[PDB]
């Protein structure tokens, strides 16, 4: 149903059976990156404090750097200088350990995702990847693109000045929908000094159940939109007459 | 030849003997005393520099810094007892977090 | 005038391919001066209680055994005894 192939095909826009109208994306790209950051002056290394054994696996074997590590509790993935080395399990954005996902049609609100098999809590699913904007280009491209009559706006604000576009290039995390009963969410992990956005689960999702995440609600124009889920307390519209960003 | 070559030491003996008469300790310093005290000072200096060199090799460095001296002194049972009331400049503290604060 | 070249001579024997900064050299200078003042002051105190007019290797050894901890003082007494034995023989 996903069927990632590099040849462009005869599906116009809906991207449900043929994914090669737009382009896909790996780890994100930058435009005006300068060497002013906390990268390699104080966050040179943040090494965990672990005294492992690493010679006894599959029999009396605890997995290395579990939920007792100093870095997993503080939402930081380890570097290559780990005492476990190539046996540490924190490095999930670098070894690309993902979850089994699939994109088919569920409701007429749009496209989304449903879980293939069972998937426990606090389990990584997908990384949000896109194109990183800056100060000036955002308020020009939003008014250049609002007059193009698009439904889906793929904007996520990383910080107070960084907004990531996942429209021209996007991974499989661009189809995930909104509901007032969230079972997945977003977290802010710091890998290699840079901040990255991920998707974790919260409960024991059955095989064949929905996987959506809660939006922090936002309007930018005069119009309003509404949600079609209706779990138990679906507001649908926004939080009134707010105008923040 | 010097007396440091006779005793086999590296710290000088005449400077220690001069500081013993000069600093008003007794109407008389003895003798074997500057050799004995130079041996004690050389042993303590070599112990501090050995632990500082180990703490410097543990962080992939080739120059001993006051942080390496701080870690070498505070990560030892008896040097912390000998130097408990001493503040080292640009030394910092030992990284530790109490177990009732971690989630 | 200080103990800097002697600290270099001691450092090049226990770790050959290493260096040391000037701040660490000043800290080692202060350490050597502090331990010198402590041992000399305690040996000056020990020579007054017995009404003697001197200071001797026995006085320095008694000031070492009172001041240093258990495992450190034994090696210090052994090194000083070996050094004062090699001075006359």
């Amino acid at each position: 149903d996903d069927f990632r192939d590099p040849q462009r095909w005869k599906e116009c826009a809906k991207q449900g059976k043929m994914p090669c109208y737009f382009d896909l994306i790996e780890e994100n790209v930058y435009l005006t990156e300068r060497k002013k950051n906390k990268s390699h002056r104080d966050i040179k290394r943040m090494q965990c404090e672990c005294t492992p054994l690493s010679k006894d696996e599959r029999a009396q074997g605890e997995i290395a750097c579990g939920e007792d590590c100093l870095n997993r509790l503080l939402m930081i993935e380890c570097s290559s200088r780990c005492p476990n080395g190539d046996y540490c399990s924190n490095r999930r954005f670098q070894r690309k350990q993902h979850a089994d996902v699939e994109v088919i049609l569920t409701e007429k609100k749009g496209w989304g995702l449903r879980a293939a098999k069972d998937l426990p809590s606090n389990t990584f699913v997908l990384e949000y990847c896109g194109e990183v904007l800056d100060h000036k280009e955002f308020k020009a491209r939003v008014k250049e693109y609002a007059r193009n009559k698009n439904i889906h706006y793929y904007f996520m604000a990383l910080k107070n000045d960084e907004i990531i576009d996942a429209t021209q290039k996007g991974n499989c995390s661009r189809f995930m929908n909104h509901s007032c009963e969230p079972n997945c969410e977003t977290q802010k992990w710091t890998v290699n000094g840079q901040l990255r956005v991920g998707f974790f689960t919260t409960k024991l999702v059955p095989s064949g159940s929905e996987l959506t995440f809660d939006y922090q609600f936002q309007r930018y124009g005069k119009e309003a939109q509404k949600c079609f889920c209706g779990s138990a307390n679906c507001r649908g519209y926004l939080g009134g007459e707010n105008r923040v960003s | 030849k010097t007396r440091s070559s006779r005793a086999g030491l590296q710290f000088p003996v005449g400077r220690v003997h001069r500081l013993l008469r000069k600093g008003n300790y007794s109407e008389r310093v003895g003798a074997g005393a500057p050799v004995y005290l130079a041996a004690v000072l050389e042993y303590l200096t070599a112990e501090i520099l050995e632990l500082a060199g180990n703490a410097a090799r543990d962080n992939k460095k080739t120059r001993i810094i006051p942080r390496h001296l701080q870690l070498a002194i505070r990560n030892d049972e008896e040097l912390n007892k000998l130097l408990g009331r001493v503040t080292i400049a640009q030394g910092g503290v030992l990284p530790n977090i109490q177990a009732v604060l971690l989630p | 005038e200080s103990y800097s070249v002697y600290v270099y001579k001691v450092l090049k024997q226990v770790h050959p391919d290493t260096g040391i900064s000037s701040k660490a050299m000043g800290i080692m200078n202060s350490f050597v001066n502090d331990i010198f003042e402590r041992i000399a002051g305690e040996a000056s105190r020990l020579a007054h209680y017995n009404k003697r007019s001197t200071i001797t290797s026995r006085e320095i050894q008694t000031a070492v055994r009172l001041l240093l901890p258990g495992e450190l003082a034994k090696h210090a007494v052994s090194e000083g005894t070996k050094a004062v034995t090699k001075y006359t023989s």
């Binding site: 390699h40 | - | 900064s21 000037s22």
Partner: peptide
């Protein structure tokens, strides 16, 4: 393959015997 900022060491120079 990776190294720290040299400024860390610059703030405390090595002792000069001369």
């Amino acid at each position: 393959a990776e190294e720290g900022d040299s400024e860390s060491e610059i703030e405390d120079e090595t002792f000069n015997p001369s």
